[PDB]
Amino acid sequence: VQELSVYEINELDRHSPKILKNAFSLMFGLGDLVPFTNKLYTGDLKKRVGITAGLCVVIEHVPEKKGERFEATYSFYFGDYGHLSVQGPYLTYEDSFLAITGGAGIFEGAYGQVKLQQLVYPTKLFYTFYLKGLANDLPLELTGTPVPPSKDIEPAPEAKALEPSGVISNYTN
Amino acid sequence: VQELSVYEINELDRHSPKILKNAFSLMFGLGDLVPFTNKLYTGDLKKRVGITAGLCVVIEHVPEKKGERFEATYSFYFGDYGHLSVQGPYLTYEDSFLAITGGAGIFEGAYGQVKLQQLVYPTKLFYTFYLKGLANDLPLELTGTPVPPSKDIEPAPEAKALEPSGVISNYTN
Amino acid sequence: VQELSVYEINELDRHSPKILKNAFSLMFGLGDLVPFTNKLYTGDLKKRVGITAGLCVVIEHVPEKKGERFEATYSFYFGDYGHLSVQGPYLTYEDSFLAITGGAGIFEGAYGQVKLQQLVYPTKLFYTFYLKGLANDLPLELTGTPVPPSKDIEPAPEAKALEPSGVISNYTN
Ligand SMILES: CC/C=C\C[C@H]1C(=O)C=C[C@@H]1CCCCCCCC(=O)O
Numbered sequence: 441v442q443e444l445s446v447y448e449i450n451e452l453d454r455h456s457p458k459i460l461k462n463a464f465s466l467m468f469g470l471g472d473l474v475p476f477t478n479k480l481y482t483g484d485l486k487k488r489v490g491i492t493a494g495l496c497v498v499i500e501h502v503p504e505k506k507g508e509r510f511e512a513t514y515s516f517y518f519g520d521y522g523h524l525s526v527q528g529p530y531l532t533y534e535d536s537f538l539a540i541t542g543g544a545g546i547f548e549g550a551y552g553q554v555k556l557q558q559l560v561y562p563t564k565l566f567y568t569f570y571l572k573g574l575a576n577d578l579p580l581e582l583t584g585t586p587v588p589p590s591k592d593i594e595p596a597p598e599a600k601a602l603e604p605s606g607v608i609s610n611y612t613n
Numbered sequence: 614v615q616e617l618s619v620y621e622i623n624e625l626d627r628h629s630p631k632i633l634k635n636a637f638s639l640m641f642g643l644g645d646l647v648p649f650t651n652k653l654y655t656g657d658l659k660k661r662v663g664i665t666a667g668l669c670v671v672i673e674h675v676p677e678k679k680g681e682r683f684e685a686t687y688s689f690y691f692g693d694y695g696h697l698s699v700q701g702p703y704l705t706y707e708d709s710f711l712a713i714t715g716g717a718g719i720f721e722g723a724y725g726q727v728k729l730q731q732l733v734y735p736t737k738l739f740y741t742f743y744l745k746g747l748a749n750d751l752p753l754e755l756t757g758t759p760v761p762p763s764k765d766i767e768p769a770p771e772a773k774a775l776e777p778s779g780v781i782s783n784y785t786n
Numbered sequence: 787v788q789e790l791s792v793y794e795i796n797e798l799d800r801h802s803p804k805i806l807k808n809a810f811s812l813m814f815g816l817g818d819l820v821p822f823t824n825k826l827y828t829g830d831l832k833k834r835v836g837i838t839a840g841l842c843v844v845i846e847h848v849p850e851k852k853g854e855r856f857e858a859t860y861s862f863y864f865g866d867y868g869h870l871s872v873q874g875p876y877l878t879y880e881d882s883f884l885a886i887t888g889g890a891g892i893f894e895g896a897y898g899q900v901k902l903q904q905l906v907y908p909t910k911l912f913y914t915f916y917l918k919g920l921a922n923d924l925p926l927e928l929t930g931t932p933v934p935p936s937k938d939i940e941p942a943p944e945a946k947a948l949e950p951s952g953v954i955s956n957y958t959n
């Protein structure tokens with residue numbers, strides 16, 4: 441297993457989330473679809489790597505937990521390195537695990553599960569991929585010691601500003 | 614290979630299915646989207662395990678077969694144990710095989726194919742997962758001898774009523 | 787690794803693509819969903835094999851490239867042989883790689899990645915699957931030398947007309 445952590449940040453400049461509201465209910469419900477795309481940073485928050493991109497399908501409102509259950513299908517993009525794809529549950533009120541459905545580029549052959557931790561609803565999430573199947577060790581610029589997750593984390597200023605020192609080559613946008 | 618069978622039943626209490634109509638047709642057509650979530654029971658029908666959850670994308674109506682072709686992306690949830698994710702053909706008129714795209718929890722590393730068997734449209738289905746890649750033998754409460762599929766199968770009364778003897782721990786709902 | 791090349795062609799007879807417009811702009815944007823299904827032919831263009839089927843989720847317009855980024859979830863159907871499922875990036879303006887999430891039939895256990903090459907937007911594409919995990923060698927009628935990719939490719943007359951010599955057994959439709 442190679443652990444890979446990343447931070448997903450919604451900086452609200454990608455038209456995301458887009459809510460397609462169709463459910464029988466005022467609250468989120470089955471029928472509601474949420475296409476989305478957020479920014480993706482390294483686990484040590486030093487570099488912008490790319491984006492998340494995909495679809496959240498509402499399954500139910502969970503009133504006891506004051507939150508929603510989604511079924512999510514999406515990918516994580518790492519510039520020229522490639523991408524990872526996942527499928528599984530996103531619960532707005534607690535951590536979950538998703539399936540790693542595959543990958544491309546350096547992530548070809550990827551399998552396993554990924555831990556999803558929401559830090560600030562809906563703007564900050566922290567992921568830990570427990571990656572199996574890779575052909576090589578991950579590049580060092582992706583495996584810096586992760587910043588421990590908390591509501592107070594922020595990407596490095598130079599990564600948010602897209603300085604060359606704060607981005608990977610041809611980071612996904 | 615570890616065979617795992619489950620029954621999927623729409624008990625009409627989860628607002629499912631939800632039809633998002635966009636095809637210019639009285640019948641299902643390309644454009645129509647169907648988010649869904651049904652109940653999942655063990656193959657021996659003794660216990661409630663969880664739910665299915667995901668999306669059926671209508672591909673075409675097939676008049677000569679009196680049914681529809683869907684393309685389906687969804688997951689099968691087994692309470693505290695984890696989940697399985699699938700992708701592939703969902704035909705209302707005949708049995709099919711779908712791809713196992715991955716899993717989480719005890720299903721981490723899962724791969725192979727799953728047989729979707731028609732039972733009673735649009736209420737009951739029977740599945741057999743041909744599971745490869747699991748870390749351990751499946752728990753016994755999930756691998757009781759399956760009830761042979763027929764139109765008149767029913768979950769055990771304790772399972773339907775969600776009594777502790779009829780559910781797995783933290784059964785998904 | 788086993789390489790498998792196929793041509794995907796929109797012959798305008800499957801109601802595809804269907805544009806579900808939800809972004810407020812005239813251009814494609816997040817919120818727009820595109821269910822689709824095209825015809826699939828062998829790499830040597832001698833035989834109809836089946837169809838593609840699934841969903842393109844618009845992620846963003848890319849004005850500097852005069853094109854779109856989609857996130858795609860779909861399958862490739864090969865008649866009685868089975869199917870392959872994929873997840874990943876679909877860019878209207880340049881080639882990409884998608885993840886192979888799994889398969890069924892002769893493609894049970896499939897993993898790897900697939901190169902998507904656009905030939906004519908929005909009508910013709912060429913794919914090269916880098917397939918791992920297959921139980922057997924691919925059937926010879928799928929592994930003929932490909933026609934050189936260009937905007938001018940056409941299926942053999944017998945394949946377009948669905949004569950026995952121009953189709954595989956129970957080709958998907
Ligand atoms: C276990 C099978 C249960 C239901 C089948 C549906 C589903 O979960 C996914 C696709 C199917 C769509 C059937 C639509 C026909 C009926 C629509 C109206 C209704 O049943 O309330």
Ligand SMILES: CC/C=C\C[C@H]1C(=O)C=C[C@@H]1CCCCCCCC(=O)O
Pocket residue numbers: 794795796802803820822823824842907908909910911
């Ligand atoms: C084999 C490729 C055939 C069609 C490509 C489409 C598809 O099957 C899935 C996504 C694509 C969407 C195309 C939207 C085109 C709308 C613009 C029409 C134009 O190019 O003038």
